[PDB]
Structures are given as C-alpha cells and as structure tokens.
Amino acid sequence: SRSESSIESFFARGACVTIMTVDNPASTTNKDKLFAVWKITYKDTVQLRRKLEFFTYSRFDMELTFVVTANFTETNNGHALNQVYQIMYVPPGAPVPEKWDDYTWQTSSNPSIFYTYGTAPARISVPYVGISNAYSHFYDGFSASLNDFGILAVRVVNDHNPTKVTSKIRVYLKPKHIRVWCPRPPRAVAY
Amino acid sequence: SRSESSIESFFARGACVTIMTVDNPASTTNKDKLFAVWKITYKDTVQLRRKLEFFTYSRFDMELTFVVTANFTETNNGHALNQVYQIMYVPPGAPVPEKWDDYTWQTSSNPSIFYTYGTAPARISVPYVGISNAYSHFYDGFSASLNDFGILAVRVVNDHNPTKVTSKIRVYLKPKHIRVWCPRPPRAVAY
Amino acid sequence: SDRVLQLTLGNSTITTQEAANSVVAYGRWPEYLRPTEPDVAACRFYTLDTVSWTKESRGWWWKLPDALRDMGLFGQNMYYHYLGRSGYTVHVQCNASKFHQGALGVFAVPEMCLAGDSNTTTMHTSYQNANPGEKGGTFTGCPVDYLLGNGTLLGNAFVFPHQIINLRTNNCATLVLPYVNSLSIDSMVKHNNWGIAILPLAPLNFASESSPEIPITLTIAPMCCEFNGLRNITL
Amino acid sequence: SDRVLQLTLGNSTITTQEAANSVVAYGRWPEYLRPTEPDVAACRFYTLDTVSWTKESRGWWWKLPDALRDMGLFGQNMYYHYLGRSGYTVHVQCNASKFHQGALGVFAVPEMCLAGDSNTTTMHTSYQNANPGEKGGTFTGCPVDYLLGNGTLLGNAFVFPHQIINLRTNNCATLVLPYVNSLSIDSMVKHNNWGIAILPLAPLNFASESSPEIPITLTIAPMCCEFNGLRNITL
Amino acid sequence: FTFLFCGSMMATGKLLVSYAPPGADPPKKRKEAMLGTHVIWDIGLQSSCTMVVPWISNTTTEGGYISVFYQTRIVVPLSTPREMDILGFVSACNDFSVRLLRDTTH
C-alpha cells in the first residue's frame, strides 16, 4: 500500500515562496515605493527548494495564493478605507516595471488580479510555461540564470491616504500535476 | 499548431480604456462635481487602440469592468460610511447628462448599475451595438466622429458627507467574440 | 570470462571482456528523435586517454559530448551543426590480476555540475576548465571527492545508473545512456548531457611489489546521433 | 529558352538555361566501378571562380579533379583517399545580350597535357603550375592557344567532345564526362583525368559601349564518386 | 526570401542568395557562402527568386544570416544606366506560429 507517498502528493502542499511588502504613503518614500517586484523563483525559500531538488527535470502547473494583511505604521489614531491590490503576474520575458506609473502597468496582456482586502485570499494558476519540455532544477554548462516563471508585481491601487498603510503579500505555491526526471542525492546541508 | 495566436485570443484581454474621478463633497465644487461623464471610445488609450487598428472593420460584444477605490482627500480624522456608485451606461444617441440632478439621471431606459464599495468590481456587457454591420476603425470621406458606443456616467449615490470622499472608476474592456475585415499596416509611431 | 567477441563499427575493433553484465540507464534504449544523420561514420568506437589508477588517486571525470569533441567524424558534425542530439555506450575496462585489490565506481550523472554553493552564480568556472576534453579531470580531497565534487555526500552517488568495477569480479564497465535533457535536440558545443565519473570505492592495494598502479580505459561509441542545419564548412 | 528548372543536389541550387542540348562524352554515362561512396555529400554542385571574357582574352583551362581540390566534401574524400575515381557534369554558362557577338569553345581533353616537345621529359612544369586550382589558367598567343597549348593545330580541337557557346544561340555549356583512364580507380591527388578548356572561336565584340567584357561561369557536379582506403584523418 | 530584380529586360547576370544557419558566422567571401546553402539566380532568365529558410526559435541571442553575392556580375546591353536596384520580400511559412503574448505602447 503506497499512496500519499506518490509524487502528486509529495508536492501537494501550499508552501510560502516569498513575503513582499507594500505601502500607501502620502509622503515621498521612493524606497519601499508603492510597488513591489519579485522574480518568480523557488530559490529564495528553503523547504520547497530542497523538495524539488531531489530531481533534475520537472513539469508542473504553477498555482499561487496571496493572503494580504495590513496595518497602520505611525502611532496615530488616523483612518483608512478598505483597500485594493493589483497583483500583476508577469510571464517570463516582458518589460519589468519600476515606478508604479509606467505603461507596462496597464499591460493589456499580462494577467493581473485586483483584490479587496479582508476576504478570501488571492488565487491564480499558470500551467507548464516552460520554454523546453521540462524545468531543469539543474543545468550544467554555460548560457545561474534558472528558467524564470516571470515576476510578481503588487501595488496599492487606491490613491495616497493621510494615514500610511503598510501591507504584506504572502505568496504560496502548489505545483499541481508535477512530473520528475532522474534523481540526484539531495543537498546534504544548507544554502 | 496555432491557437492563442487566433483573433479570439488576440483581444481576449482586459485592458484599461479610461480612469474617471468622482467625489462626495459637502462643499460646493462644481468642477469635479459629483458626476463623471466620458465618451465611450478606445481612442483615449494606447495599447488597446493600436491592437484594433490592425484592421479596418469589426464586430465585438462589448463588456466592461469597473474597479472602484476611494480615500479621504483632506488631512482630517473624519469618517464616512460605505458608499454606492450608480454606473450609467448610455447607448449611443440619448441625452448626455450634466448636473447630476436632471431627469435623464432617472432614465427608465438606460441600463445603470449601483455598486457598493469594497467588493467584487462592477461588470456588464453590451453586444454589437453597431448602426452598421461592422465597426469601422477607419472611415474615409465626410459625414473625426467615430462610431460611438455611448457614454459612461458615474456619480456618488449617497448624499453629502462632512468628510469629502474622492473615488476613481478604472474602466476595462474585453471585446469578447471579435471579428475583423481587411488589415492595414499598423501605425508606425505614437498618437 | 572467456569467449569474448569483437565488434567492428566499420573502423573500430573491440574484443570486450565477454559480456558479463551491462547497464542500461533507466531501462531505456537510445532511439531516433521522432536532420543530418552520419550513422557509422560518427557511430564508431573512439578511445579516450587511458588514465593511471594509483594508490593515491581521488578519481576521474568526463563530460559528454565534451570529451569526444576532438574525435574525428563525430566531432565534425558536432562543430558543424548548431542543433544536435545523441546517445553513448560507455565502456570502461580496467585489467589487473588476482594480486590486486580495489573497487571502481563509474557513475552517469545527467548534467554533472561541479562545486560552488554560490547557486546565485553557477558555471563560474571558466569555459576551458568546464570542458577538459579527452584528457579528463580529477577529483580533489574544486571537485570534492566525497561530495561528488558538488556538495552531495557521495554515499548516495548510487542514484545515477552505475556498475562497480570490483577487481575480484568483472574487469569492465559497460554503461548505455540514452539522450536525456528537456530539449529534443541540443547545442553540443555549449551543453553537456552526461557526466561519466570514476571514483575509488575501495583503495588500490597490490601484493608486495608489482604494478605500482594500474590502468583504466574509456572507449565510448555514440548511439544514434543526428544534427540540424549544416553551418559554414570551416576548414 | 524559358521554363528553366532548378536542381538541388541537397545543398546546391541551379536554375539552368532550360535544357537546350547537352553533351555526353562518347555517348557514355557515368556508372559505378563493378570503397568509400559519399554520394550526395560529394555529388553536389560546386561553383568555380567566374572568369572574365574580354576582347583581348586568349582562353582559359582547368584540370579535373584538380580545380575541385579545395571543394568541401568532394575534396576531403579526395585528400583522405589513396585510391579514387569519379565523373563530372560540366556546366559552363555565359550570359550576354543581343548586342554582343562571339563564339565560345569548351573542350573535354582526357589527359589535357600542356606544351614541351621535350617528349624526352614531360610534366617538367612544376607541380603547382600543373595544378592551378579553382582560380584556373589561361592560354597565351606556355599554353599556345592555336596549338591547344600542346603543339597541335587547334582547328582539330574538335576531336574531343564539345559544345560551342555561340552567343546568338545558347548561353550555356553542358558537358557530361564519364571516368576515363586505363586504371579502374586512381590517385586523385597526383593524376588529372579531364581537361576543360574554354577558348574563343569568334572574338568578343560588343555594340557601342556596354559591358567592356562579359562573364563565363563553371559549376560542375561530381558523378558517382568512390574511393579506396580511408587514410589518417589529418585535420 | 523573395527577390525582385529591378533592372532591364536587356540586362542579365547571376547573383547568389545564401543562408548559413545559426552558429556559422557571416560568410565573408563568395566561396564561404557558396560552399553551403546557396541559390544561383539568373537575372537574364527571370525576375523572381525564392529561397526558403528552415528551422529557428526566439527569446526577445544569435541566429542565422541571409546574403546576396555577385555570382557573376551585371551584363548591361548597349548604353543602359549602369546602376539599377532590387526588392526583397520576406514572408512566413505554414509551420510558422507564435507563443506567450506581450506588448509595448507609450
């Protein structure tokens, strides 16, 4: 009897990949400026990374869940109306945004999702968007530059509010329908 | 193998067309007065415009999505109860409103949608409302005055509040079931 | 084992051990991509630099097709074709007596990378150092031997298909590796498919004084090779 | 003549005149010796140095296979095989208008020797001077033009198979020459089978001022080539 | 690739269209291009030349090259303008398609 043990249940978990931070300041703070940009990789985390690394090749439908919690940074009795956050999924190779202003931010192509705080977390799925037939966790030679599933972009959709509201985008990934080729001994230590 | 490449997926995108601004002032501000009026065209934007312009004739079911975010303009600790915004879709050739007061604003014909802030964005659809068999992106000669899909109208439904709440209507358009006749070389530069 | 037979791939002459157990990588045979197909011209035994297994040795390693870059016909197609794929019949023989004692470990690592926990940046090593040709490379006690040169505790190096040349048993290694990679065809020049490494499992010990060390041999034959687009015939 | 068709010997592209009369040497077709057979690799159109037919010209000449020594695949087999034989489809086109007047003479001399009544000693000329490659040689008014460069009154140069590129007729030359020699196979390096020479029968005269001269082109295809013994693959 | 010879009916010559697939560098001398896939195109026989390009792939870093060479040279009849032109027309093949939709507008 061998079930839960199978591939489709070795990765059938919702593990965090990244934690991105945004804000809605009325003041001029260009550092953590409104926008948040992060390169879609598994590389940042630990848990999910080692798991995949048991193999050399893969194919997986890539789903993502975005729970978003906020708060008021300054010790003030100030207020804020419920907010919205546009989550821009960017497919590999496109123009990467900076200033939350730019044309790219209107996309007309890139799938984006607007979410209103204080509800059931954000959710989408990107099927096997491999430029090859598989996602090579390792690649020996010269073109490291992995595969690239794209980049995630989130900003505060609502305008500048007298009371600065800081938020966080906890990103989780369930690699549904995963397939793997030729295993390696796993990484002994830490990264 | 040619799919995503086909017409039904060349335009199967939700691209912004316009960003309209409203307010709920207790003070007398007749400029950005309560009402917002905008001529339904693709002409304002860039991205969506060039796309269509690849062809000379078209038919498309015209859907629209209205995400609405707000805020308090004045640096005050003042408050506001959740609001509602009547979105008036106006079919081409009707009386265009001014003062948010007028008879037209009661319509009895024009489809309008009331929305309560802080939920799933506003959504409707207008099928091929062409006075011809197709929407000519270009038309050579004399009657420029395009085709006219009508005008969008939004106001704050709730009465005057001591604390002035400014909102924005981000309008997106997915031209579902689109059909095109005789292509032109696309516009080289900018508009 | 006696009754050993030679196979002549037109030009090449073998005279194996006999047969005494062979290894197929994940029970798969090299078959054609479903192009320039040289067949017999570039599907014939080529012998790499015979290396010296010494008491002190840490091991050896080669990349595919890298090693066979300077190999006549196969190497031509390789250099004259942008797109290309192939298979390999690895044959590592090591002959000693009944007065020598040791165990050889031949592994087949698809994409055999080496060192640097600087995942941030891999390859790093220079193009020349990453591609040491027919002459081959050696592990060091940087290809850290007991970490497969790649930070991974060697005791598991048995994940990849392999045979153990145990002196007191078979004096040969026979590994068949069909084409592995995400791509259907590949830049042979730039990308290395397989990694044939040969490390000592048991050390080399010889009775009294004899052969102060012994020799290991790698002759490999390309299996069903093909290529795309004949580029400029640069001579 | 219109309706001209291209033939693609894998790599090569032709687009002939159309067809307008071809010549078979002694009504014989190149057939296999009844070996290394490259086929399509070395049986594909190669273009020699296009030369300039000028009022003043005396003629031009090439040796087979000599000219095609520096020709990719065919030249490899040629240099890598001690014993070897072949055939050739000589195609000499010369395009002008209805404002040019002249007559070109293309001859196929099996063993086209040049000069020296010193029968006592032939060859004499140096190995390099006897083998001028793709670039070709020219007659002089020493290859004495009206003596076929070989002491024999040119008026008879019509013994060998030939076509006359008469400007006002066909703007092409199509000569097929099966393998001729006493031997069944030969030292391609050392021995030249055929001699394609092209001399003016009528001079070049052009109306008023136009093309101060015109161009002649030699693209030839080896016909059923084979070789014996693959020597050292010297790269 | 399709070429239109924009010279006189009276004018002639042979040109050479070449394509060295990826990896190979531009073939600097006639011979180098000629050695590979080449098309000898006679002017004095037709104005229309078409040479199809085989297998290629994108990520918008190096591909192939297409080149034109004076196989022979231009034959001018009598007193005709010694400098005429040519027109090139590229078009996709049946097998040509696309994937992953992006943009650019300002």
Q: Which residues of E touch C185 (CB under 8 A)?
A: none
Question: Does the CB of A55 have a partner CB in chain C at under 8 Å?
Answer: no
Resolution in A: 5.3
* Strand order, beta sheet including B84-90: B36-39, B151-156, B84-90, B112-116
Q: Which two tokens stand for residue B177?
A: 């079931």
CA distances (Å), E91 to each of E2, E3, E4, E52, E53, in order?
8, 12, 14, 9, 10
- A and D in touch (3+ CB pairs within 8 angstroms): no
Burial D29-47 (b: 16+ CB within 10 A, else e): ebeeeeebebeebbbbbbb
Strands D172-177 and D23-24: parallel
Asked, as a colleague might, if the bond just before B185 is cis with ω within 30 of 0, I would say no
CB-based contact C231 E54, cutoff 8 Å? no
Element (H, E) at A21: strand A15-24
Q: Which residues of E touch D46 (CB under 8 A)?
A: 34
Q: How far is A190 from chain C (nearest CA, A)?
A: 9
Residue from A184, A187, A189, A191 to probe the interface with C (highest C Cβ count within 10 Å): A184
Contact of E56 with E7, CB cutoff 8 Å: no
Question: Does the CB of A121 have a partner CB in chain E at under 8 Å?
Answer: no
Q: Which two tokens stand for residue B98?
A: 């001014």
Selecting from C83, C189, C232 the residue whose C-beta is nearest the C-beta of E20 gives C232
Q: Which residue of A has its CA nearest to C147?
A: A188
- What does the DSSP assignment read for C158-173? TSS-EEEEETTS-SEE
**Closest C-alpha among C89, C112, C67 to residue C12:** C89
CB-based contact A160 B69, cutoff 8 Å? no
Selecting from B15, B45, B77 the residue whose C-beta is nearest the C-beta of A77 gives B77
| CA gyration radius, chain B | 19
Give the Cα separation of C173 and C3 in Å (integer).
17
CB-based contact E12 D15, cutoff 8 Å? no
Q: How far is C26 from chain D (nearest CA, A)?
A: 36
Spatial neighbors of C120 by CB under 8 A, at least 6 apart, are none
**Chains contacting chain D through 3 or more C-beta pairs under 8 A:** C, E
CB-based contact E55 C228, cutoff 8 Å? yes
Give the Cα separation of D106 and C105 in Å (integer).
69
* Number of cross-chain residue pairs from A and E with Cβ atoms under 8 Å apart: 23
Question: Does the CB of A133 have a partner CB in chain E at under 8 Å?
Answer: no
Q: How far is D235 from chain C (nearest CA, A)?
A: 8
Question: What residue type is C65 in one-letter code?
Answer: P
Selecting from D72, D230, D233 the residue whose C-beta is nearest the C-beta of C233 gives D72
CB-based contact D230 C11, cutoff 8 Å? yes
**Closest C-alpha among B27, B43, B64 to residue B137:** B43
Q: Which two tokens stand for residue E30?
A: 């006639």
Selecting from E60, E100, E106 the residue whose C-beta is nearest the C-beta of A91 gives E100
Selecting from A136, A140, A141 the residue whose C-beta is nearest the C-beta of C182 gives A136
CA C206 to chain centre: 26
- B and C in touch (3+ CB pairs within 8 angstroms): no
Which residues between 57 and 76 in chain E have a beta carbon less than 8 angstroms from any beta carbon of chain A? 59-60
Burial class (CB in 10 A: 0-12, 13-18, 19+), D12: buried
Give the Cα separation of A140 and C180 in Å (integer).
12
CB-based contact E102 A109, cutoff 8 Å? yes
Q: What is the 3-state secondary structure (H, E, C) of chain D?
A: CCCCCCCCCCCCCCCCCCCCCCEEHHHCCCCCCCCECCHHHCCCCEECCCEEEECCCCCEEEECCHHHHHCHHHHHHHHHEEEEECCEEEEEEECCCCCEEEEEEEEEEECCCCCCCCCCCCCCCCHHHHCCCCCCECCCCCCCHHHCCCCCCHHHCCCCCEEEEECCCCCEEEEEECCCCCCCCECCCCCCCEEEEEEEEEEEEECCCCCCEEEEEEEEEECCCEEEEECCCCC
- Tell the residue number behind the tokens 């059931």, with chain if given: A120
Q: Which residues of E touch C231 (CB under 8 A)?
A: 20-24, 36
Q: Which residues of A touch C184 (CB under 8 A)?
A: 133
Q: How far is E102 from chain B (nearest CA, A)?
A: 11
Q: How far is D41 from chain C (nearest CA, A)?
A: 11
**Closest C-alpha among A157, A139, A154, A42 to residue A90:** A154
Q: Which residues of D touch C72 (CB under 8 A)?
A: 233, 235
Give the Cα separation of C231 and E35 in Å (integer).
10
Selecting from D13, D98, D99 the residue whose C-beta is nearest the C-beta of E39 gives D13
